[PDB]
Amino acid sequence: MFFLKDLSLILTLHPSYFGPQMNQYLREKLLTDVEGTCTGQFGYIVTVLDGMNIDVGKGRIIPGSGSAEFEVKYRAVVWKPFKGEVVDAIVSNVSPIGFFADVGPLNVFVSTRLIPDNLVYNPSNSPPAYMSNDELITKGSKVRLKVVGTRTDVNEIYAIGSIKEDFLGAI
Amino acid sequence: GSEKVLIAQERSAANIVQVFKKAAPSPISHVAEIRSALEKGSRLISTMQ
Amino acid sequence: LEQMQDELIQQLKLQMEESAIRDANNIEQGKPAIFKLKLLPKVKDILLRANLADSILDNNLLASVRLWLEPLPDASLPAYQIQKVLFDAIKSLPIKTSHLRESGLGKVMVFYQKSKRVEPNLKRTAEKLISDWTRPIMG
Amino acid sequence: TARLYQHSSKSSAEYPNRPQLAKYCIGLAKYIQSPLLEYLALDESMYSLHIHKHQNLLPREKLIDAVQTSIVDIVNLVGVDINEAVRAPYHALALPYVCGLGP
Amino acid sequence: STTITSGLKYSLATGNWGEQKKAMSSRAGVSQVLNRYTYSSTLSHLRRT
Amino acid sequence: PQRLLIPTVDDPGIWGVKVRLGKEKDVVRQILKKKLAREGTKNPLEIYSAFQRDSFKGHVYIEARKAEAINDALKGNVNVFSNNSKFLVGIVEYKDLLRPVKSSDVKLTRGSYVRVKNGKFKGDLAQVDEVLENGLEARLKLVPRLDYGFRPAQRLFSEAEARVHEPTIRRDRDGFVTYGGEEYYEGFLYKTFRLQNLIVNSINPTLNELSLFQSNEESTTIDLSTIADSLKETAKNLVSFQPGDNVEIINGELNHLTGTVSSVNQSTIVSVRLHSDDDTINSETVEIPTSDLRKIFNVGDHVRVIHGKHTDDTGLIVEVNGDKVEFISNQTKRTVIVFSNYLIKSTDSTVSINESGRFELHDLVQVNSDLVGIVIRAQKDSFDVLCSDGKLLSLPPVSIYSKLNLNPNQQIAIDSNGVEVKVGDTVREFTGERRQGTILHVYRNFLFLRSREIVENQGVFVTSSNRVKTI
Amino acid sequence: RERACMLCGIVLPGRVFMQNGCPNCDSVLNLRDSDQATVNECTSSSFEGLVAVGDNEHSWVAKWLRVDRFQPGLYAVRVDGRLPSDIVAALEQYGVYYRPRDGSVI
Amino acid sequence: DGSPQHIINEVEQLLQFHVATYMDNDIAGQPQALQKSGRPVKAIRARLKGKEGRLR
Amino acid sequence: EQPTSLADVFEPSELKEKMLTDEDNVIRVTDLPE
Amino acid sequence: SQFPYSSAPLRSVKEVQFGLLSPEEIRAISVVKIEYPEIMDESRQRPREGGLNDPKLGSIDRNFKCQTCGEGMAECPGHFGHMELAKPVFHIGFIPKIKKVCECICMNCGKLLLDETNPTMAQAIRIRDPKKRFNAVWQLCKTKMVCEADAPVSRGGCG
Amino acid sequence: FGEMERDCMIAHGAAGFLKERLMEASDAFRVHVCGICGLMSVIANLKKNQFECRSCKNKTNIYQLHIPYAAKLLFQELMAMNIAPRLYTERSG
Ligand SMILES: [Zn+2]
Ligand SMILES: [Zn+2]
Ligand SMILES: [Zn+2]
Numbered sequence A: 001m002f003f004l005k006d007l008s009l010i011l012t013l014h015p016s017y018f019g020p021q022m023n024q025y026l027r028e029k030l031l032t033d034v035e036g037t038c039t040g041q042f043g044y045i046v047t048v049l050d051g052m053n054i055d056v057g058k059g060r061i062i063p064g065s066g067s068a069e070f071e072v073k074y075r076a077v078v079w080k081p082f083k084g085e086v087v088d089a090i091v092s093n094v095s096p097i098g099f100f101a102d103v104g105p106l107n108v109f110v111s112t113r114l115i116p117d118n119l120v121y122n123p124s125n126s127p128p129a130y131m132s133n134d135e136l137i138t139k140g141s142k143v144r145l146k147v148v149g150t151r152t153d154v155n156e157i158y159a160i161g162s163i164k165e166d167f168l169g170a171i
Numbered sequence B: 001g002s003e004k005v006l007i008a009q010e011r012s013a014a015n016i017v018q019v020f021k022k023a024a025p026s027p028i029s030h031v032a033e034i035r036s037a038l039e040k041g042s043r044l045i046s047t048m049q
Numbered sequence C: 001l002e003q004m005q006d007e008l009i010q011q012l013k014l015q016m017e018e019s020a021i022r023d024a025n026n027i028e029q030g031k032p033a034i035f036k037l038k039l040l041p042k043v044k045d046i047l048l049r050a051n052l053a054d055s056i057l058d059n060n061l062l063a064s065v066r067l068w069l070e071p072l073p074d075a076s077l078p079a080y081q082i083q084k085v086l087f088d089a090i091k092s093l094p095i096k097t098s099h100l101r102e103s104g105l106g107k108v109m110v111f112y113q114k115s116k117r118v119e120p121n122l123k124r125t126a127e128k129l130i131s132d133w134t135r136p137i138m139g
Numbered sequence D: 001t002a003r004l005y006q007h008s009s010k011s012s013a014e015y016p017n018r019p020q021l022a023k024y025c026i027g028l029a030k031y032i033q034s035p036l037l038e039y040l041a042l043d044e045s046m047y048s049l050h051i052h053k054h055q056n057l058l059p060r061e062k063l064i065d066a067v068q069t070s071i072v073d074i075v076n077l078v079g080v081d082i083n084e085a086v087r088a089p090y091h092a093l094a095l096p097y098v099c100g101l102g103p
Numbered sequence E: 001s002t003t004i005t006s007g008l009k010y011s012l013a014t015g016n017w018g019e020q021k022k023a024m025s026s027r028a029g030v031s032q033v034l035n036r037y038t039y040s041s042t043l044s045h046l047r048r049t
Numbered sequence F: 001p002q003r004l005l006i007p008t009v010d011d012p013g014i015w016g017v018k019v020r021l022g023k024e025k026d027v028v029r030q031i032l033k034k035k036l037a038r039e040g041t042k043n044p045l046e047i048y049s050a051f052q053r054d055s056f057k058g059h060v061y062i063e064a065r066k067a068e069a070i071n072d073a074l075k076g077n078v079n080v081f082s083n084n085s086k087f088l089v090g091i092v093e094y095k096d097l098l099r100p101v102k103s104s105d106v107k108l109t110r111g112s113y114v115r116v117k118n119g120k121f122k123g124d125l126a127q128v129d130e131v132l133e134n135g136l137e138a139r140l141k142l143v144p145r146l147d148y149g150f151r152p153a154q155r156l157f158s159e160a161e162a163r164v165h166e167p168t169i170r171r172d173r174d175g176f177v178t179y180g181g182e183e184y185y186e187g188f189l190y191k192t193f194r195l196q197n198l199i200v201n202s203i204n205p206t207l208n209e210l211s212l213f214q215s216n217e218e219s220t221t222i223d224l225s226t227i228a229d230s231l232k233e234t235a236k237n238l239v240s241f242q243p244g245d246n247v248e249i250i251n252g253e254l255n256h257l258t259g260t261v262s263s264v265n266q267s268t269i270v271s272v273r274l275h276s277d278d279d280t281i282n283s284e285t286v287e288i289p290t291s292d293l294r295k296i297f298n299v300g301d302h303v304r305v306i307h308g309k310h311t312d313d314t315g316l317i318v319e320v321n322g323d324k325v326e327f328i329s330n331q332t333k334r335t336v337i338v339f340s341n342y343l344i345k346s347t348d349s350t351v352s353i354n355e356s357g358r359f360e361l362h363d364l365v366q367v368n369s370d371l372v373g374i375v376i377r378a379q380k381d382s383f384d385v386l387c388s389d390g391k392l393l394s395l396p397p398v399s400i401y402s403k404l405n406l407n408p409n410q411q412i413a414i415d416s417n418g419v420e421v422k423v424g425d426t427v428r429e430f431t432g433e434r435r436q437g438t439i440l441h442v443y444r445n446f447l448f449l450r451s452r453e454i455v456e457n458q459g460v461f462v463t464s465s466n467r468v469k470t471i
Numbered sequence G: 001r002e003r004a005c006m007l008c009g010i011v012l013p014g015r016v017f018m019q020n021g022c023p024n025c026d027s028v029l030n031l032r033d034s035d036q037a038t039v040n041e042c043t044s045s046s047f048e049g050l051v052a053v054g055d056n057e058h059s060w061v062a063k064w065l066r067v068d069r070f071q072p073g074l075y076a077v078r079v080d081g082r083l084p085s086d087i088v089a090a091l092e093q094y095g096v097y098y099r100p101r102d103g104s105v106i
Numbered sequence H: 001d002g003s004p005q006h007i008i009n010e011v012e013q014l015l016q017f018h019v020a021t022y023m024d025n026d027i028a029g030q031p032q033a034l035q036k037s038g039r040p041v042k043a044i045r046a047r048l049k050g051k052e053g054r055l056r
Numbered sequence I: 001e002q003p004t005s006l007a008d009v010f011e012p013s014e015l016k017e018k019m020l021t022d023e024d025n026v027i028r029v030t031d032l033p034e
Numbered sequence J: 001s002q003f004p005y006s007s008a009p010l011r012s013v014k015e016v017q018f019g020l021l022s023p024e025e026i027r028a029i030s031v032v033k034i035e036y037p038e039i040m041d042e043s044r045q046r047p048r049e050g051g052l053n054d055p056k057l058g059s060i061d062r063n064f065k066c067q068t069c070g071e072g073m074a075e076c077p078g079h080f081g082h083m084e085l086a087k088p089v090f091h092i093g094f095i096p097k098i099k100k101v102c103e104c105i106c107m108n109c110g111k112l113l114l115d116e117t118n119p120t121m122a123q124a125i126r127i128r129d130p131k132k133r134f135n136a137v138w139q140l141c142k143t144k145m146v147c148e149a150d151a152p153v154s155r156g157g158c159g
Numbered sequence K: 001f002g003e004m005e006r007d008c009m010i011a012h013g014a015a016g017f018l019k020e021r022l023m024e025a026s027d028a029f030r031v032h033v034c035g036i037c038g039l040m041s042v043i044a045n046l047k048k049n050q051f052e053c054r055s056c057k058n059k060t061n062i063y064q065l066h067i068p069y070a071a072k073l074l075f076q077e078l079m080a081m082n083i084a085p086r087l088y089t090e091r092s093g
């Protein structure tokens, strides 16, 4: 789910960049170091609002190292999945152990043990799919799934979905 | 292999009565002290006050 | 002063018996025993008060103590908190042979001693208390 | 097979008081004596051998099936002694790959 | 024979005048290494209290 | 009877006296001899009994009525210390001083499976074919460890190989063979072992040894009573609790109730706050014995395996089949079914791979005869390798050939301009993404650059030496 | 070398038990008239808790150990091993009940 | 195994003494813990005090 | 206080590795190449 | 710049908060349980796991890395283990304070011997400094030698 | 560089020289502290780039400090005596 959050970043600048263009350079450095990153605490930062008019304040010189430390506060759009949430998805891969879907930047893996039994995996089909009499879910097929668990990594998030309840599966 | 020397040790003589004045913060004003030592061996045995 | 303590202890006895009956019914109705746990704090506070021991012995509250300690017909032992509190109270009071005769707690004490689901510390305390209570009879 | 055998714990259990180079030489000698049995001893590590230039392009299941078919064909062309297989498990490695049979 | 030998040797070697296991509370510095920097220093050391 | 003999106030008192260690039985014998010698005399030793216990070291207990009697008994003995270290034993302690010990088990049962403390079969599981009536030794059924001409692996005694390597085999019966002074019965060694050579509790069986032992019984593991008892012991002892664990109650009046562990005291009393639809009940904390608690595992929780073949494996709970719980693994990324007794709800893995396998992180290893790669992430069961091509592979540690140990005279890199670049230097890609990083390993024309800015594969990316320039 | 007679609980050297038998249990065990197997089955060298008794009649310990009707001497609190089934039946024939001193029975 | 109160008191008092002297070996009113060489044990408290202690 | 299934005795992964499951017995009984 | 790079931000200490360690915290921050008195496994290197020289506690050898953090000798700070005591024992540094606290409260109901009804007690509670507050409360409650099961109405005491 | 020299350096007012003498020219050390419990119990693995405080079960609120090795030793010896010195990088009032 997408949100607006007020975040802050600590930026350290080398003395070789102490020029008139210091502020703009700090702005592009912030944009390059925040746009697209993935933090387990917050999720995924997709964009920074008002990216060219961010206040940086006054940097403090670190005693003994010369480099200046800047405290940058900004508002950004953040997306983070939650346990027990039902969202739309697009299937990216089909495999005997289960199928992998994509919910924005997040890639969700659904095991066969969380798939209804009638959706038997068909490897002979082109492309291979988990199909039933009235349902056929393959690569590129819209699916509505509920996120059950989320795994936190260093700079990545792994989520597990399920389609075993009602109003789920193919859409 | 190392040469060791015994340094003479100074001590108070025995078998002599020593009378001392104790300080004010005490019920005792004067003390008579004597330490006894047998002639054979010259070893300290007991002290009396 | 002390007539009032006897009345209060009798009221506590009635409350304890009613709570035991309610918990037994609830277990028979498929529900956990909660009333004994609810009444446990007040019983603990009353028992910890030493000067009320004489009134307790004059009202024979040990009968209700044994009733609580008596295992229910489902072969389920009482809650460990209840057993611990009752054992501590039994230690804290001067139980004599007459009080044991009035209450008949020796049977439950022997059952606790012989049983194995009982905590080993409670087993040792039961052995100690049984020996102490047999002490006056033989001398 | 010798390089893989010098690191396998099967050699360590077989030879607990021998150096790694001794295990390597033993693997070489066993390969000379019988290449088929040594290739069988690889068990799962045989799939990591450099078999074909584009061996990694195939899916793992297809490559495993191809290896199984090749080894079954070869061992059935060879033949397995039941008595020796019972006498020694090393010669019994070839028993599951006979046609009709299985692990 | 080791008792007296070791006791005397230890007390003379280390300077602690007492039993080895009672090193604390024993008078230390009784035995010292002879000063041989010059003849006068040795003579002075041998007559020290 | 036994109950009626408990002591009274008028019974003779008991005194305990400290003595020198190891002389307790000597003092007892001396006291008995003195009592016998002075018996029938004008001044007999007016005591009644004296004894000691092995556990209560340095103490000798005498039953008498007077302290002067104790002094008279101790007079003339050298093991008694200088001070009269005597105390009056409390009457309640009278039963405890003479209560028996080691009553945990009645006896060693013939046919039971036990482990061996020492000897050539140190640790091998052994069946108790015979229990000697003395109780100090017992004849056991073992798997022979022979080489037939640092110990050989256990193996059933093979008569043909034994004769080929040693034709001096003896025969005494049918199926009972004596080779080299050792009696082997139908392929299994039968040898007496002392009681001090066996572990009769906390026995850990393996299905391999169980099959090797039960194959001759015409059925695979037909006997399973002692095995079931061992399973119960392993299940009971392996349970460890922490605050915040969701548990369920098996026995007691509060059976079939859920609660969260609030605090842990010792290892047998756990304070639990129960959860129920009634608010007044949810605000109460109950101390409950651990023997009547079962962990509650909800679907979609990070859980780490405590013990077993999958030790230190973590994952997310997927299916809860009562006793057995299923979870998708993190390293192998496959479903594993392990009992709920071997799982702990650990929200963070942080698995350390040290002391496992042969290779560590950032190791340039040879995948096969053609492919050479570097380690990006290590697992308890396998390794993740980035190869020179730019792809990722997963292989067991055994399958990997070996580490490519290269001297600085072998690991040499030359940039586009021809200037030599060594290990750890920083270079920038001449074209393409124009990235930069520190060199990790050099192989042929391939360089393994790592940069902290890059997140993919922990910043490791392969770039040819011809496309980078020295910084 | 010393062994503890299982029945009465006395402790004496095993060779003494073989040559002379148990001075107390000879009325029901015939230990002297018994072979080494029976001596071992009624006298065990593995025991614990050496006990010296001076006056059987008045010692509460002797009553507690049921040795107040036996000869004073060396006795063991706990003795490893129990009487055999055949010897148990033989003693039950005599009308004497055997209470094990192994501690496992109480 | 078996619980004579005198033995329990002795052993628990020994444990209390060891734990106390592990952190403070200058408790006035009782003998200090000594090493096999006869020197007193350097408790943790002694590590922190004096000119040669941690702080100074 | 008083109370065999090999599933409870050892982990299912170990049982499948050692070939002691119901699929194993069905395969061994079945008259067909594996 | 002499330290290997760590992604954690570098900050400086601004406050030192003291206190005691709860047994729960000691068990939580520990990495291994110490139970075997033998320092060495079999005097054949590789000190016994679960002993006083467990490799998980940290490494002090150049060629041995810590089994907990994986860092070298120059970087491993050392990791704590915990030892369970069979019976609780006094902390030698707090015995006088334990005695004072025992004097301040009742040994049965576990409640203070004085209440805010006393003007002096309320005045003492009004102070802010914990040490002076405890000193005043002890000076007052020392004199009170009997628990009251009734108000000096029940005050919660046991009498 | 004893205490009297430290007092002389304080009197001169040279804080940078004093810090350099007592840290860079001596036992300088780097530790990680949990941002919640405030203890030095973070199990930091620099090569794998993962930090984790088991007691607080957090992976994010973690900072690093530069303190003298003797200070680390003193805090560990204090923890050995059941005293918990918690280091916090922000004030609270
Ligand atoms: Zn006899
Ligand atoms: Zn470490
Ligand atoms: Zn009170």
Ligand SMILES: [Zn+2]
Binding pocket: K034, K035, K036, K037, K038, K039, K053, K054, K055, K056, K057
């Ligand atoms: Zn923390």
